[PDB]
Each structure stands twice: as structure tokens, then as C-alpha cells.
């Protein structure tokens with residue numbers, strides 16, 4: 429019976445699935461967009477405003493005044509100016525701005541020369557700040573909570589940040605089917621095994637009624653019960669199986685780690701007779717019977733249609749997280765430098781008075 433599903437025959441598939449199941453209820457840090465440069469630019473805007481004429485200061489309203497409501501620069505800059513005016517209203521803020529810049533009690537001629545000296549500096553800093561602001565916006569949905577929810581959808585079919593647990597109603601799309609064979613199919617019209625947890629049930633469960641493949645996923649599982657007939661009571665058996673797993677992903681979670689996990693699974697799916705299979709398959713279907721199979725049947729999956737594996741909900745959710753992280757990793761690294769530059773521009777602005785006095 430070497431060709432039947434025996435204890436440990438799905439052990440290596442189970443190690444890969446355990447790594448994926450450990451993405452449930454995840455508490456990870458994400459790569460941080462360094463936005464300290466936004467504050468540095470705001471400080472430059474405040475210095476610029478402080479040094480401006482009484483006529484300019486008088487402008488500061490929800491939109492530019494009549495005559496400028498359609499000027500594209502005023503439309504762009506209005507909220508930035510308004511924020512600077514508001515921040516300068518705060519007790520002793522303007523005095524602190526001027527002191528940092530060497531412009532306390534500055535003669536009027538010096539205030540004007542200083543403001544003019546800031547024109548090229550601010551023009552250089554604008555596009556740097558605008559890129560940093562764009563990165564912030566582009567990445568604002570790459571958060572620990574959004575990742576946890578997506579990964580809990582992947583593992584357990586539960587769109588929640590924490591407290592996700594095995595429940596067949598959520599782990600199998602629409603709950604378990606009439607038969608194990610139908611429950612353990614994914615990608616077909618009647619796709620059912622749409623989570624990592626359902627995949628583990630299908631690849632690892634002990635069916636009731638004899639001729640089961642208990643301990644296919646490892647001899648150290650203590651199957652205290654079974655999955656029932658046709659997965660009717662899979663939850664108790666899943667608890668025994670998952671108790672043997674304690675994979676931990678790298679922290680912070682990376683796109684590379686997630687991509688490597690999906691590639692590993694992809695490299696293990698085997699094609700036979702027009703379907704793909706994860707887990708040992710002998711004949712008939714992925715039924716939980718030792719002489720048939722303990723597997724997921726990727727119905728109609730072939731090497732040439734493998735793109736469809738990436739549309740299965742769990743795979744798509746993990747892929748989406750990986751893609752979000754892939755972008756945020758790079759944008760976080762870019763933002764470090766944008767922010768350091770903007771802080772450097774603030775320091776430059778604070779020095780122009782020394783030059784001009786001399």
C-alpha cells in the first residue's frame with residue numbers, strides 16, 4: 429500500500445502549509461514612510477511667510493482671493509500657505525522660526541533679501557516634498573491592520589485583524605460541500621477550498637468511518653477525533669492538526685518571504701489527468717480515503733493555465749499583500765533620503781541670513 433496515503437506522506441506539503449497558516453492573526457511592522465521631511469518643508473513655508481509683506485500676510489479663507497482662484501500655482505499652494513499661516517498663529521511660533529533662522533530683530537532690508545534668497549531653495553524643495561507627499565498617499569493602505577485582515581482572509585476566510593479562528597463556514601467558500609471530494613476542489617466553477625485552512629483540512633484530515641489517512645501530515649499530530657463524514661465536523665480535527673505547527677514568518681514581514689512561500693507551493697502542485705493536486709492523490713478524488721487521496725484538486729488546472737491558481741482567494745490575498753509590501757519597501761527607502769534632504773534644506777534656509785548680513 430505504498431501508493432495509498434500513509435502516515436507522513438503529506439509531511440513535506442504540510443511544512444509549507446504551516447508556514448502559510450502562520451500568517452494568521454499576524455502582528456507585523458511595515459516599512460515606514462519617513463515623513464519628517466514634510467515638517468521640515470512646513471517650517472520653510474513658515475519662515476517664508478514670516479518674512480513676507482503685510483499685504484501678502486493679509487491674504488490669510490478656503491480658496492485664493494478673487495483674481496487668483498484659477499491660477500494653478502495658487503490652487504496648488506493655497507492649502508500649504510494656509511497651513512503655514514495657521515501654524516504661525518501659535519504662541520511664540522513665529523519668534524522661534526525667526527530665531528532658528530538668525531532673523532530675530534532683522535532689519536527690514538535683511539528680511540526681504542532673506543526671503544528672496546529662499547526662492548531657489550524652496551523651488552528645489554518643492555518637488556522633493558511633493559514626491560514625499562505622493563509616496564505617503566500611495567502607501568497609506570499598507571498598514572499592519574490591512575495586512576492582518578488580508579492574511580486572515582487568506583488563512584481563515586475571516587476579514588478581521590485579530591481573533592480569526594477555524595470555522596468551516598468561512599474556511600470553505602459557502603461552507604463544506606455535500607462531499608469531501610467536492611469540498612476539496614478549488615479553481616473550478618464550484619470552488620470550495622479557498623483558504624489555507626481549508627487546504628490543510630483537505631491535505632491532512634482524518635475522515636470518520638475507517639480507511640482514513642490519519643497522520644498523513646505528520647506522526648506527531650494527535651488526532652483525538654476526526655473530521656466527521658464529508659468534513660461535517662472538520663473543526664475539531666483541524667485543531668489537532670494545527671496544534672503541531674508553529675512557524676513564525678520573518679519580522680517585519682517582507683514581499684520576498686511571501687513570494688517565496690507562494691513559489692514553493694506552486695513548485696509542489698502536480699498535474700495529472702487534466703487537474704492539479706496538492707497532497708497525495710491516487711485515484712477518484714480528494715476524498716480523505718487512504719486509497720483515493722488526501723489533497724486539494726485544482727480542477728482543470730494545467731501548467732499553461734497556472735495563472736488561475738493565483739486567482740484562488742487565498743493566493744490572491746497573499747499576492748496582494750506581497751505586491752503592496754514590494755512597493756512600500758522601496759518607497760520607504762526612498763523616503764529616508766527625501767526627508768533627509770528636506771531637513772537639509774531647512775538648515776540651509778536657516779543659514780541664508782548669516783551670508784546676507786556679511
Ligand SMILES: *[C@@H]1O[C@H](CO)[C@@H](O[C@@H]2O[C@H](CO)[C@@H](O[C@@H]3O[C@H](CO[C@H]4O[C@H](CO)[C@@H](O)[C@H](O)[C@@H]4O)[C@@H](O)[C@H](O[C@H]4O[C@H](CO)[C@@H](O)[C@H](O)[C@@H]4O[C@H]4O[C@H](CO)[C@@H](O)[C@H](O)[C@@H]4O)[C@@H]3O)[C@H](O)[C@H]2NC(C)=O)[C@H](O)[C@H]1NC(C)=O
Nearest residue numbers: 473476477479480481483484499500501502505543550551
Ligand atoms: C513665499 O512667500 C512669497 C510671498 O512673500 C510667495 O510669493 C508669491 O508667490 C506667488 C506664486 O504664484 C506669486 O504669484 C504670482 O503673482 C503674479 C501677480 O503678482 C501680483 O499679485 C500678488 C497678489 O497679492 C502680489 O502679492 C504681487 O506682489 C503682485 O502684486 C501673477 O501674475 C503670477 O501668475 C503667473 O505665474 C503663475 C506661477 O507663479 C502661473 O500659474 C500663472 O498662470 C501666471 O503665469 C502665466 O502668466 C505669466 C504672465 O505674467 C507668464 O509669465 C507665465 O509664463 C504664464 O504664462 C503668480 O500668480 C506672488 O506674486 C508672490 N508674491 C510675492 C510678494 O512675491 C511665495 O510663493 C512663497 N513661496 C512658496 C514656495 O510658497
Ligand SMILES: *[C@H]1O[C@H](CO)[C@@H](O)[C@H](O)[C@H]1O
Nearest residue numbers: 639640716717718719720
Ligand atoms: C477509503 O474509503 C473509500 C470509500 O469507502 C474506499 O473506496 C477506499 O478503498 C478507502 O481506502
